Amino acid sequence: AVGACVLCNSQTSLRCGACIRRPFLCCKCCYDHVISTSHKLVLSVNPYVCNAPGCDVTDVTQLYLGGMSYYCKSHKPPISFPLCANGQVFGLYKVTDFNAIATCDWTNAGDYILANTCTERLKLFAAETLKATEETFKLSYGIATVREVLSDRELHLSWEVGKPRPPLNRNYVFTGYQIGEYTFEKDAVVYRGTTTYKLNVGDYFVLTSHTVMPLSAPTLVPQEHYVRITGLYPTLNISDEFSSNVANYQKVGMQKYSTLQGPPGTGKSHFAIGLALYYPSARIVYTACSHAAVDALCEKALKYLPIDKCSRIIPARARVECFDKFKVNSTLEQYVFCTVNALPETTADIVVFDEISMATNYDLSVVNARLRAKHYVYIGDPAQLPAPRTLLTKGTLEPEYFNSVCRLMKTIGPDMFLGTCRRCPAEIVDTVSALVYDNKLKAHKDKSAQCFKMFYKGVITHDVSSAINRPQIGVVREFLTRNPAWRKAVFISPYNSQNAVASKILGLPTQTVDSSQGSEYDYVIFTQTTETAHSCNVNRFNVAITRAKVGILCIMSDRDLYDKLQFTSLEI
Ligand SMILES: [Zn+2]
Ligand SMILES: [Zn+2]
Ligand SMILES: [Zn+2]
């Protein structure tokens, strides 16, 4: 019960009992907190409560120290001091932002803005408070019980009355009862068990509520600039393939941490793997939030790095199928590929943290706590999608507030920028360059003359709140009859329900914009589905159209984004 203050490090015995994380607050800060919020419970060795029998006074502003005990105004002895007086709360060893983080419900974008603009210690307090709030909210959802099993991929569910039903998508992962993790997609529903189990009638599913551990490390260690490359030994015989990144690799060794903004198809994994070739004896840990981002780094390493010096770290509680070509769980290999939540406690010469737009400050702090490194390299793009904020329903979260790294890239600029898109036809590059990259992204490919747009609002139906636009799918079906090369296209939309309908009618493989991030396909067919803040988000739009290597068809609902697409318009 004795620790350091979350606002000024000052030692104290006080903790706020009303704060979900019970942070240590010194006398001067505890006061400024209790006197400005609904939080009045103060904790020490013993709580600050009226010691008089049967009395229920817990408010610190209505309590006094009567010798060594605590009493209210009704029970205090004549010789007593108020607990709250003179800008302090009585304790041993004798904030507007702290109050807002401590009392907010995390449903407003302004809550996330504050969590990223506050001091470093408050960024950790905000990250821990937010994550704990998110887990408690998982308890609010009703239990799903198997009413009947149709097949190996379809079943019927019975829901708990009086409790809301969580959204049905890949985002919401359930735990069967422990018959493995399971996901569902929309009376017949599609079930997806991580472990193959013959679904028993009567069995039930609940959201995996994990305990939020406290944070200790900053989101970003303090920056250090060096006069020479430090702790790393470069090659002189560096492959021509990687020559373009040599100055950037030297920048990496001459600073404690560095940020790399890599727009779609500009060479982020190529840069990441090339760093291993540039500092050939360096031990590098490659991390990202998702298994897919870690696997994409493994695929690039498989091509350039010796397979015997690589290891893919997989947590024993296996959720999705991941990279099989490296030795599994060998923490001491020179190259370690592992998701943030599975990171071991280790050291490295370089830590490469990829897909940085998807990280939260909680992830940034976890990395700094598990990995002690000479250099930290953050790779991603603040113009791409952030991690979903399940609690946030009011306001839009701007890229500068995704996390500390994205905030730096949007305010002072990234340390390094990969300026040439090698994936996309010039129509796509020119569109996103103007949209989100301030005209700094250059096209390498010519215009493919296979980038088309159609303005067609159609009809919007809804599967709960997830949207469907059957007429936009009908336009795609007509287009496919006329453009058979597009038979190989991936169908993309901002909605799972739109994708489920397109899958049955078109037979094309399907991705949401969010699940398509990091992937590329020759042909993409995109149906905007609706004109909402979700389907019009410029980062989501950017990711949607930069998935294409050769052609893209965009069936648009929004006039603004339609007019911005530098594509050939199709009639109807
Ligand atoms: Zn303090
Ligand atoms: Zn509090
Ligand atoms: Zn009392």
Textual characterization of the structure:
This protein is of the alpha/beta class and 572 residues long. The protein has a domain at 426-564: 3-Layer(aba) Sandwich (Rossmann fold), CATH 3.40.50. The strands form 9 sheets. It has an 8-stranded parallel sheet, sandwiched between helices. Helix 2 packs parallel to helix 4, helix 10 packs antiparallel against helix 15 (538-545) and helix 11 packs parallel to helix 12 (496-506). It is globular, with a radius of gyration of 27 Å. Bound molecules: zinc ion (3 copies). One zinc ion binds next to strand 6.
What would you call the quaternary organization? Answer: monomer
Largest sheet: 8 strands, parallel
By CATH, the architecture of the domain at 426-564 is named 3-Layer(aba) Sandwich
CATH superfamily of the domain at 426-564: P-loop containing nucleotide triphosphate hydrolases
Give the helix/strand class.
alpha/beta
Q: What is the CATH top level name of the domain at 426-564?
A: Alpha Beta
Query: Ions, cofactors, ligands: which are bound?
Result: zinc ion
Helix segment tally: 16
Q: What is the end-to-end distance?
A: 70 Å
CATH T-level fold name of the domain at 426-564? Rossmann fold
Shape: globular
Strand content: 15-25%
β-strand number: 33
- The percentage helix is 25-40%
Cross-sheet strand order for the largest sheet: 19-18-20-17-21-22-16-23
Rg from C-alpha positions? 27 Å
Domain (+)RNA virus helicase C-terminal: 419-572
Catalytic activity: ATP + H2O = ADP + phosphate + H(+)
Domain CV ZBD: 1-105
Binding site for Zn(2+) 11: 5, 8, 26, 29
